[PDB]
Amino acid sequence: GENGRKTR
Amino acid sequence: GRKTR
Amino acid sequence: NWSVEDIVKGINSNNLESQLQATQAARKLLSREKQPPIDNIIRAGLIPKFVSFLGKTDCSPIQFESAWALTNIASGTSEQTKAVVDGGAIPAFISLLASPHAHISEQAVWALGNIAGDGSAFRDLVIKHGAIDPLLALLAVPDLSTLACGYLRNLTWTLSNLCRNKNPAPPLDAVEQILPTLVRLLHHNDPEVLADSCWAISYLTDGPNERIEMVVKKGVVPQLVKLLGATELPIVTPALRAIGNIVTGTDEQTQKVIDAGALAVFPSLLTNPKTNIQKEATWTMSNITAGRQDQIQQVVNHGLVPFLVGVLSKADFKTQKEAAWAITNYTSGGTVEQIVYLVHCGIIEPLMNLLSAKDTKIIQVILDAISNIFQAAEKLGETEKLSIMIEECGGLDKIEALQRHENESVYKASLNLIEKYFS
């Protein structure tokens, strides 16, 4: 993935 | 020339 | 499911177990799918208390719950991530990297990844607080396969965010320190680790030639070419981006890509059903056809010229623009024999057909290629045989129209060939 932030 | 992108 | 008011009451109770249950309730609120009340928890002033709980080494449950709660806040907008940083969370999370509990250390890695992912400023601030050394120490094992799968994926993703966001690029010594570990991850057998390692390499190669050289010197090009032929699109996309960045460098750096066998993958890349893969593969080709004549010859020998003809004839318009750039670079630096081979593959008619596009730039690019082909025609003496080809496929009454165009580059770049090769 190339996403800046992940939520958990 | 080179196209940077 | 608690209200924010009840969470504030429990955290303000100065009862550690009450604060733990209130923090866990906050973690569950922030873990909702539908609209986590991040702003409400921020306005309640809970972030400084969450950060304080990160240091409660005797109560590791409350360390874990606050770290998770802060991680979900830092995953939000830039202002929400700023609130986590403004609460002093960066040095607190870096201390948590040394936690003996893997789930707590992993949560700290996750949070630092969200913070560094905001942009170059928070990335560099995470580096200034000294996060790279403890992060790397977590991967200091002889075989990565002994680490937990989710633990390894989170470390790869976080290290990848430390490589992102130019203006400015990451510090040189930081990339220097990171790169050997990143190469280990680029060889790991996990598809998600491979994707994020490829993205990081693509970030590091999105820079001047000096940045590309650091990556190429580590020998990753053969592995990038191998991952270029993977069946997973999440792996091909970053690998092709990294390859495309490297061929924007010097001719010698471009030659390493060719030597690794990258050109043998492009028949399928230039016909890939994913529109963006075709566009990026064609962009990569345009920067290879801008190289030396022996490198253009490699494109010829791999049978890639017919594939450029096909992309120019039928593709998404942005891919056709990259193909026109590839032909213009090809004709600009190629030999007469190479340019003749290009015409024999049928480049003229799809080149003429794209002179109807209302995009002004591609018209200038195409008119440049036609001029270069005519220069090769003058050297052979077939300057008139080519004029008939452009006339037969309808290209002659497309250049006449470009004479009555508003842009002054196509203005003159249309009368020039009318006056020389047709009139």
Author numbering:
A (entry chain A): 209 to 216
B (entry chain B): 212 to 216
C (entry chain C): 75 to 497
Text taken from the publication that reported this structure:
Unlike surface proteins, which are highly variable between strains and mutate easily, the nucleoprotein (NP) of influenza A virus is a highly conserved protein with roles in several stages of the influenza infectious cycle. The primary function of NP is to encapsidate the viral genome, consisting of eight segments of single-stranded negative-sense RNA, into viral ribonucleoprotein complexes (vRNPs). The best-characterized NLSs, often referred to as “classical” NLSs, contain either monopartite or bipartite stretches of basic amino acids that are recognized by the adapter importin α, which binds the receptor importin β/karyopherin β1 to transport the trimeric NLS-cargo:importin α/β complex into the nucleus. Our results demonstrate that NLS2 is an atypical monopartite NLS that binds weakly to the major NLS-binding site of importin α and synergize with NLS1 to confer high avidity for certain importin α isoforms.
To visualize the interaction of NLS2 with importin α, we co-crystallized mouse importin α1 lacking the N-terminal importin-β-binding domain26 (ΔIBB-importin α1) with peptides spanning NLS2-K (198-KRGINDRNFWRGENGRKTR−216) and NLS2-R (198-KRGINDRNFWRGENGRRTR-216). The crystal structures of ΔIBB-importin α1:NLS2-K and α1:NLS2-R complexes were solved by molecular replacement and refined to an Rwork/free of 17.4/20.6% and 18.0/21.0%, at 2.25 and 2.10 Å resolution, respectively. Clear electron density for NLS2-K/R was observed at the major NLS site of importin α, and, to a lesser extent, at the minor NLS-pocket. We unambiguously interpreted 8 residues for NLS2-K at the major NLS-pocket and only 5 for NLS2-R, supporting the idea that a K at position 214 of NP-NLS2 results in higher affinity for importin α. The residues visible at the major site correspond to the C-terminal basic box of NLS2, which validates the mutagenesis analysis in Fig. 2B,C, and confirms NLS2 is a monopartite NLS. The average B-factor of NLS2-K residues 212–216 bound to P1 through P5 is slightly higher than importin α Arm-core (84 Å2 vs 50.0 Å2), but is nearly half than the B-factor at the minor NLS-binding site (120.0 Å2), where the electron density is very weak. To decipher why an R at position 214 results in decreased association with importin α and reduced nuclear import of 5GFP as compared to NLS-K, we carried structural alignment of NLS2 with other classical NLSs solved in complex with importin α. This revealed the critical position P2 is occupied by R213 in both NP-NLS2-K and NP-NLS2-R, in stark contrast to all known NLSs that have a K at this position. The lack of K at P2 in NLS2-K is likely compensated by K214, at position P3, which provides a register for correct positioning of the NLS at the major NLS-binding pocket. Finally, position P5 is occupied by R216, which is sandwiched between W142 and W184. Increasing the concentration of NLS2-K peptide to ~215 µM, we obtained saturable data, which we fit to a one independent binding site model, with Kd = 72.4 ± 10.0 µM.
